[PDB]
Amino acid sequence: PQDLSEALKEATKEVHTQAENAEFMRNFQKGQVTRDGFKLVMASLYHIYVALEEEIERNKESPVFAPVYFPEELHRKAALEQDLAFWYGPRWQEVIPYTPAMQRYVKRLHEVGRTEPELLVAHAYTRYLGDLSGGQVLKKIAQKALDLPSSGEGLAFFTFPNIASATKFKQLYRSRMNSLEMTPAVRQRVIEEAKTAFLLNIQLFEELQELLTH
């Protein structure tokens, strides 16, 4: 529809369905993730969020992004650093995997942030609004699958401490997406970039599934 938030949701419905059908996601939802698989996911998220959040910081003052700049509410890099120190130990930064599908996603994030920051909102939407949607249900499926020690670390990623109500925040973020001023041409490019963002996630999950069969 007219609102960017509605147009994004409509335009990405098909690719979101593709994501729901992905082998890795079917497995994840059914509690079939192993510690190895979960670690790969966390490492992937770290690389992705490092790049996204670097680009957000670069562009935070620009009219094409400032309205959707919510650093305290949304930032995930620090939580992922905490979790990776648990999952991979003190040398995590040296030992975490960085695979081609992770690299392709990072590469696109930097291209967008450096050369077409007007499309960064498509990437922030796809990452943050999705990741905020797996409330306690996704954390618990993982928690049951992983059988973690009682050491109070490893799942920080699944809690956004600065957002009390996901619905409340999501409605605000949608409004801010809708506040963005763009030409019809740019709006179309933003929609296409959200599809690209979903496709980069789908390709990532396909690669991770392939790595886990070896």
Ligand X SMILES: O=C(Cn1ccnc1)[C@]12C[C@H]3C[C@H](C[C@H](C3)C1)C2
Binding site: which residues?
A: 9, 16, 125, 174
Q: Which of 7, 15, 40, 41 binds ligand X (CB under 6 A)?
A: 41
Name residues whose C-beta falls within 8 Å of residue 73's C-beta, 6 or more positions apart in sequence: 160, 162, 163, 169
Q: Choose between 17 and 133: whose C-beta lies nearer to ligand X.
A: 133
Check: CB of residue 40 under 8 Å from CB of residue 208. yes
Alpha-carbon distances of 85 from 40, 73, 160, rounded to whole Å = 14, 22, 18
Sign of the Cα pseudo-torsion (38, 39, 41, 45, in order): positive
User: Which among ligand HEM, ligand X, none contacts residue 126 (Cβ within 5 to 8 A by kind)?
Assistant: ligand HEM
Which range binds ligand X by CB under 6 A, 3-11, 133-141, 143-151, 185-193? Answer: 133-141
Which of 81, 130, 166, 176 forms a contact with ligand X (CB under 6 A)? Answer: 130
Sign of CA dihedral 75, 131, 198, 61: negative
User: Whose Cβ is closer to ligand X: residue 40's or residue 190's?
Assistant: 40
129 sits near ligand HEM (criterion: CB under 6 A): yes
Residues that bind ligand X (CB under 6 A): 28, 41, 45, 130-131, 133-134, 138
